[PDB]
Amino acid sequence: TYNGCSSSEQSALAAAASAAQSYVAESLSYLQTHTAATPRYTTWFGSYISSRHSTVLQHYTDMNSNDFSSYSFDCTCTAAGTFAYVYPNRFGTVYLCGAFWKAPTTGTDSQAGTLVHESSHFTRNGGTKDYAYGQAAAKSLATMDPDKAVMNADNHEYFSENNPAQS
Amino acid sequence: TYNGCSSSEQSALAAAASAAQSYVAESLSYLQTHTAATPRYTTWFGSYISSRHSTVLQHYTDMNSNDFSSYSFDCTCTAAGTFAYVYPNRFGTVYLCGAFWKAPTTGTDSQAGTLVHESSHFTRNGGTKDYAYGQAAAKSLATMDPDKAVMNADNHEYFSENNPAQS
Numbered sequence A, B: 001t002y003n004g005c006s007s008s009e010q011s012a013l014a015a016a017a018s019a020a021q022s023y024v025a026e027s028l029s030y031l032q033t034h035t036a037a038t039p040r041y042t043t044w045f046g047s048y049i050s051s052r053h054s055t056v057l058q059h060y061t062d063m064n065s066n067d068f069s070s071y072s073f074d075c076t077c078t079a080a081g082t083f084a085y086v087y088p089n090r091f092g093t094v095y096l097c098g099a100f101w102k103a104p105t106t107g108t109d110s111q112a113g114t115l116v117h118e119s120s121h122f123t124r125n126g127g128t129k130d131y132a133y134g135q136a137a138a139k140s141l142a143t144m145d146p147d148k149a150v151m152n153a154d155n156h157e158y159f160s161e162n163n164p165a166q167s
């Protein structure tokens, strides 16, 4: 459903939700078939170990079961510098702000990637936190504190967006 | 008891066992009072998280209840290239080889530290494995795979020997 969203915003959300669904799907498949260290994994989740891999696998297994297209979207926020926000304990509802509309549908820090980010925050999906923001801090977190990286929303977004792409 | 141990090997073992008991005791106390990341813990057990700290705490809780002075020591092994060995499912018996007698009572890769290493192998004490050998590999294991570090014998020995000393 939509709340305070214009025709164009609903269309953008429709496209972003579908692309977010695909990101999560390809991301889950990747985690299920890659059970050893790979560039794409270590860059965003650090040194590969079974327990952490299971953690991220679980997050995507859960997010994959979500219906991004059925999320309750709210576009009343007009903050030009904010992308989106959610309440971890209030599942399926995403609040969009001004910066979301200026972001590309797919790619780095995209609308679709933003939904994957926010989705990971839901307690049902793993309850990720925001320990680091942006690709640079996300990669640094992966290198220095992998345990936090597998619990950081941006690291999930960047793992899914995979841009620049890695195997 | 002693199996094939001279009077000099027996008294040396009594000292090594007393010092090992002291290592395990101090190591347990440390683990009980340090419930947050510290250099001594992270160097040998990796990034601090409750579950991992609980694992090593348990190992030392059990090892502390062991009585090293009552271990059945066997001195028939004469392999100068190895310190000692045990069967995980055969508690309380340690087989010492040639290299053990050349080592110092306390310090890095000491007689006391070797007893801590071997003790951790007993299933009753946690059943650690030998994923890495030597300080360099042990530290590397701690940084790359914390889960394996808390289950690696050498990491326990070095945490206990604490040389160089760390807070």
Ligand SMILES: *[C@H]1O[C@H](CO)[C@@H](O)[C@H](O)[C@@H]1O
Pocket (backbone or CB within 6 Å): A037, A038, A039, A040, A041, A042, A043, A046, A047
């Ligand atoms: C993550 O780090 C590993 C090295 O451990 C590589 O597989 C990859 O290139 C990425 O930097």
Ligand SMILES: *[C@H]1O[C@H](CO)[C@@H](O)[C@H](O)[C@@H]1O
Pocket (backbone or CB within 6 Å): B038, B039, B040, B041, B042, B043
């Ligand atoms: C273990 O690693 C931490 C860094 O996460 C340090 O605080 C400590 O000195 C040790 O290297």
Ligand SMILES: [Zn+2]
Pocket (backbone or CB within 6 Å): A117, A118, A121, A129, A130, A153, A154
């Ligand atoms: Zn966030």
Ligand SMILES: [Zn+2]
Pocket (backbone or CB within 6 Å): B117, B118, B121, B129, B130, B153, B154
């Ligand atoms: Zn061993």
